From Swiss-Prot, chains A, D:
KW Glycoprotein (keyword) present: yes
Outcome of swapping residue 81 to R: In Baylor; unstable
Organism from which the protein derives: Homo sapiens (Human)
Result after altering residue 52 to H: In Summer Hill
Lineage, opening ranks: Eukaryota, Metazoa, Chordata, Craniata, Vertebrata
Name of this protein: Hemoglobin subunit beta
Phenotype upon changing residue 30 to S: In Tacoma; unstable
Gene name as annotated: HBB
Swiss-Prot record, chains B, C:
Name listed for the protein in its UniProt record: Hemoglobin subunit alpha
Mutagenesis or variant effect for residue 138 to P: In Attleboro; O(2) affinity up
Function: Involved in oxygen transport from the lung to the various peripheral tissues.
Additional observations: Gives blood its red color.
Assembly: Heterotetramer of two alpha chains and two beta chains in adult hemoglobin A (HbA); two alpha chains and two delta chains in adult hemoglobin A2 (HbA2); two alpha chains and two epsilon chains in early embryonic hemoglobin Gower-2; two alpha chains and two gamma chains in fetal hemoglobin F (HbF). (Microbial infection) Interacts with Staphylococcus aureus protein isdB.
Effect on the protein of changing residue 57 to R: In L-Persian Gulf
Effect upon mutating residue 6 to V: In Ferndown; O(2) affinity up
Outcome reported for the amino acid change (mutating residue 131 to P): In Questembert; highly unstable; causes alpha-thalassemia
Length: 146, 141, 141, 146
């Protein structure tokens, strides 16, 4: 992605304050509550029946953590999102059968969680930078679909 | 919302489909799978090679449901009821994909109905597939 | 469809907004123009700089319309009637844009309501914002 | 865009049969009738009251041939769409204020028109090829937006 000097520093400074453990568990839990059809990929997680159920589900929590950690490695290679996520891309297509559209939804929920967590620190210009990041991460994940 | 003119337009064009609905439904799907490859993520369990029985069957299922929607156009929600529940609770197809199938059904129809696919029928058809899609998606959340 | 638990969540969250509604309205817009540069093509007549009064003024109108939407949650199509004629016949904003404002509105809410922006309230607001969007574009064609 | 050799040949072989003026007017016309909001830019064109009005509008027909002419010349530069449309992208953004979403709509309308005009020769694999071309052009036309 193309980020201005101001945008790169915005993204980077905020990420430093994030605990992946908990921002991950939140973003995934919220994906499963707000867009219930995404629950189709997680039948083995168990009870995703109530907002309280999804949020307290430990499998959701472990998974959200796994996802965000991979996401974290990408920030470090913002210059080549495509090359970085190629392996995971093939995996999500060939073995998992995840419609890439889901990537976009996750991106949007993550922005929401950053806003909620940080409040007024998460300003318009910070948002915009993070919108570019997520969109580029989503395109990187969908890249090897065929 | 569909005007009366729209309903006349849809019933007329779908009339001509008549007996080919099932073959049209197969061609639209095959066009979807080829132009929009991500839609294949929902048919991992299908043999998606051209002319497969699975596609032709499914194609026929999809067309029957459109015909039904055409017959009960003044009351779509009630007619597609069972179909909304299935897509909402079981299949769980992301709403974006209905748009891509809608588009390939329109290309199918243009290609087979030279005489009838006027500007005004095209608009009515497009509004019609948008309502069907809205119905099919109405119980997602 | 908005459930009774939905309607409660919305009334409650929009209750907290209160007199800041105008202010949240404007930030949401600002969030939109910066994250989604294409939306600016509809305000070629406005000064889009930060602190712009024009943005502020429009932010207030938007927010008041939604306060109106919340008041009439069971009769939305009648409350928003004039607004839906307006965007369909004059402004003519492509429907994709309502999703982008809706998301910026959501992020503005999240950032201002740390205690109220629960997973469930998040879900009812997103539902509520899709219904306002559906009403506002219902007369496009 | 990324097209294999066979995809370009298909594209170029069919296009060879196109009457540009004829299809230009038809596609623009249908856009205006199927997605009426797109009429916002064309107030100076005159009567746009009915489908017949639109389809018979000389202003629409002339806009359509200029539009598709430009498209037509881009087909010679499938390897460099961005370079070819960069200036046009700037005009659309800075002076005409056109939402790039309009470009995605015309693309789809265009594909419906070739299908209507070519019947069975517009096969599934020929569609696919053309779907890339159209997406390619719309992306290129939106690339200088800011
Ligand atoms: C956009 C960011 C995403 C990233 C970086 C990501 C990354 C990952 C990683 C690192 C794994 C683990 C593979 C392993 O541990 O061997 C994985 C597995 C998985 N992902 Fe994704 N993912 C993302 C989004 C999604 C979304 C939105 C969905 C579906 C809604 C999804 C569905 C899955 C599933 C079903 C698994 C397998 C879990 C299991 O074994 O039960 N992912 N993903
Ligand atoms: C115009 C819109 C659509 C119509 C009328 C429709 C109708 C149907 C019908 C009649 C069935 C079979 C029902 C049965 O056997 O009880 C079905 C199943 C299914 N549909 Fe939908 N559908 C539509 C859109 C979609 C889209 C867009 C997709 C995915 C991109 C999709 C994915 C499926 C799947 C995966 C199944 C089950 C296939 C199988 O295992 O047989 N549907 N649909
Ligand atoms: C929740 C969604 C929205 C609401 C409630 C809303 C509501 C309104 C209201 C109440 C007005 C002023 C009407 C009047 O009193 O004259 C207005 C005007 C306007 N809206 Fe919408 N709108 C929405 C979404 C959008 C979006 C997404 C766009 C474009 C991206 C848009 C573009 C405009 C424009 C250009 C005007 C006129 C500005 C002026 O010249 O002052 N609207 N809107
Ligand atoms: C393949 C997509 C398109 C191409 C290649 C294209 C190309 C062009 C060209 C070559 C011109 C004249 C530029 C000049 O003055 O040098 C132009 C102007 C213009 N375009 Fe686009 N265009 C496309 C899509 C659209 C769409 C979808 C719309 C609106 C719905 C649009 C609206 C306009 C308008 C309003 C003008 C100005 C006409 C005039 O001033 O008489 N264009 N376009």
């Amino acid at each position: 992605v193309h980020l201005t000097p101001e945008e790169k520093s915005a993204v980077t400074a905020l990420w430093g304050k994030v605990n992946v453990d908990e921002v991950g568990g939140e973003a995934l839990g919220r994906l499963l509550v707000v867009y219930p059809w995404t629950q189709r990929f997680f039948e083995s997680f168990g009870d995703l029946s109530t907002p309280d159920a999804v949020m307290g589900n430990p499998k959701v929590k472990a998974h959200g953590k796994k996802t965000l950690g991979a996401f974290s490695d990408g920030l470090a290679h913002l210059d080549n999102l495509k090359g970085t996520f190629a392996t995971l891309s093939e995996l999500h297509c060939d073995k998992l059968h995840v419609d890439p559209e889901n990537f976009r939804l996750l991106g949007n929920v993550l922005v929401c969680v950053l806003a909620h967590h940080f409040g007024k620190e998460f300003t318009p210009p910070v948002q915009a930078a993070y919108q570019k990041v997520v969109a580029g991460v989503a395109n990187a994940l969908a890249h090897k679909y065929h | 919302v569909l005007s009366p003119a729209d309903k006349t337009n849809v019933k007329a064009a779908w009339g001509k489909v008549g007996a080919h609905a099932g073959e049209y439904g197969a061609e639209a799907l095959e066009r979807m799978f080829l132009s929009f490859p991500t839609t294949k993520t929902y048919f991992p369990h299908f043999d998606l090679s051209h002319g497969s029985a699975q596609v032709k069957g499914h194609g026929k299922k999809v067309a029957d449901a459109l015909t039904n929607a055409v017959a009960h156009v003044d009351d779509m929600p009630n007619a597609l009821s069972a179909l909304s529940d299935l897509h909402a609770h079981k299949l769980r197809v992301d709403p974006v994909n209905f748009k891509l199938l809608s588009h390939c059904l329109l290309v199918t129809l243009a290609a087979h109905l030279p005489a009838e696919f006027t500007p005004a029928v095209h608009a009515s058809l497009d509004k019609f597939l948008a309502s069907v899609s809205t119905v099919l998606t109405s119980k997602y959340r």
